[PDB]
């Protein structure tokens, strides 16, 4: 059975639930994302009306199967009437396709779904600008103020310093990244540029990166891996066993690898910083840990909310653990007194 904070009140519609079976009152199944937490239960014999953006539904009809007639892309910063209620949908700042949506009740609420986010200031110059939010279903993955982590840019500048000294002290050096899902893409993708190779990856892969219109995709991967010096493996794989296993394969063409794992956050972010990183390493291999996020800091979180200033707010994950969900009202309730809304 479907819960409360996945229903849409006054509406048909549900958000990122397909995995209860048919729910009583759905006319439209909306789908934020291509994430598997989110699209669990979608296949080829679906049959119901499903929202999202252009690159979900391309992942949705190449990816899972799902049959063409039942896929309702829909373009961003766009006014849509669905089953007769005005929609939005905003870039998410997550993975590629990632939406937040915007729904205007026939009773003159308005409903925010963050979807999963990486809030931004940018934000607050979107379609957002322009009227008030009753209700914000709200992307709480990092909501305590232990969880800080760097931007994007300054991940991405270390990670490309990294490779690139590396593999000009040895020319004979594999770059190697880790992956489980879509996003994060500008990892692989930066370090193969300053490198001036394309990525090597596995046919599913590359059939997966071929579905999120990327300009120029057909100019930076590939799966010829002989001719690549980045190549993408299987999250799985990035340890010292998997690793030394690939190498083997390589045919003698390479002596070292330096492997990246983008995580989200982990503890080393309490007290290190990006440039001071160092690796594990073992021989002839080296494995960085990189914290680059698809999801808001809180300091983040924080900012986008008390600019917004809901009347109210659901939150979408951490909701299991009474401990959790007190911590979190906590929060909102100082944000609220602290801005005066
Ligand atoms: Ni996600």
């Given at each position: 059975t479907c819960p409360f904070?996945?229903?849409?009140?006054?509406?048909?519609?549900?958000?990122?639930?397909?995995?209860?079976?048919?729910?009583?009152?759905?006319?439209?199944?909306?789908?934020?994302?291509?994430?598997?937490?989110?699209?669990?239960?979608?296949?080829?014999?679906?049959?119901?009306p499903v929202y999202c953006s252009e690159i979900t539904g391309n992942l949705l009809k190449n990816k899972l199967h799902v049959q063409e007639q039942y896929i309702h892309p829909l373009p961003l910063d766009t006014e849509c009437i669905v089953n007769g209620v005005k929609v939005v949908l905003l870039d998410?700042?997550?993975?590629?396709?990632?939406?937040?949506?915007?729904?205007?009740?026939?009773?003159?609420?308005?409903?925010?779904?963050?979807?999963?986010?990486?809030?931004?200031?940018?934000?607050?110059?979107?379609?957002?600008?322009?009227?008030?939010?009753?209700?914000?279903?709200?992307?709480?993955?990092?909501?305590?103020?232990?969880?800080?982590?760097?931007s994007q840019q300054e991940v991405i500048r270390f990670a490309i310093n990294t490779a690139f000294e590396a593999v000009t002290l040895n020319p004979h050096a594999l770059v190697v990244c880790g992956t489980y899902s879509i996003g994060k893409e500008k990892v692989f993708l930066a370090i193969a540029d300053v490198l001036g190779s394309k990525v090597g990856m596995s046919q599913e892969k590359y059939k997966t990166l071929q579905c999120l219109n990327i300009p120029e995709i057909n100019s930076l991967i590939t799966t010829d891996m002989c001719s690549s010096l980045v190549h993408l493996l299987p999250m799985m794989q990035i340890n010292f066993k998997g690793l030394q296993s690939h190498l083997?394969?390589?045919?003698?063409?390479?002596?070292?690898?330096?492997?990246?794992?983008?995580?989200?956050?982990?503890?080393?972010?309490?007290?290190?910083?990006?440039?001071?990183?160092?690796?594990?390493?073992?021989?002839?291999?080296?494995?960085?840990?990189?914290?680059?996020?698809?999801?808001?800091?809180?300091?983040?979180?924080?900012?986008?909310?008390?600019?917004?200033?809901?009347?109210?707010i659901i939150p979408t994950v951490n909701v299991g653990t009474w401990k959790s969900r007190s911590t979190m009202e906590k929060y909102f309730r100082e944000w609220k007194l602290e801005a005066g809304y």
């Open positions: 904070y996945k229903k849409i009140p006054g509406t048909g519609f549900t958000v990122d639930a397909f995995q209860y079976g048919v729910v009583e009152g759905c006319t439209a199944y909306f789908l934020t994302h291509f994430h598997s937490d989110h699209y669990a239960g979608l296949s080829k014999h679906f049959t119901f998410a700042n997550h993975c590629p396709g990632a939406v937040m949506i915007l729904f205007y009740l026939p009773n003159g609420t308005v409903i925010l779904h963050t979807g999963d986010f990486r809030a931004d200031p940018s934000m607050e110059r979107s379609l957002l600008a322009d009227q008030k939010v009753h209700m914000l279903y709200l992307d709480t993955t990092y909501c305590s103020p232990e969880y800080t982590f760097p083997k394969k390589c045919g003698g063409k390479y002596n070292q690898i330096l492997a990246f794992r983008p995580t989200g956050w982990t503890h080393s972010n309490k007290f290190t910083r990006i440039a001071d990183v160092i690796p594990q390493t073992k021989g002839n291999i080296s494995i960085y840990g990189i914290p680059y996020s698809e999801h808001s800091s809180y300091l983040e979180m924080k900012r986008f909310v008390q600019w917004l200033k809901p009347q109210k």
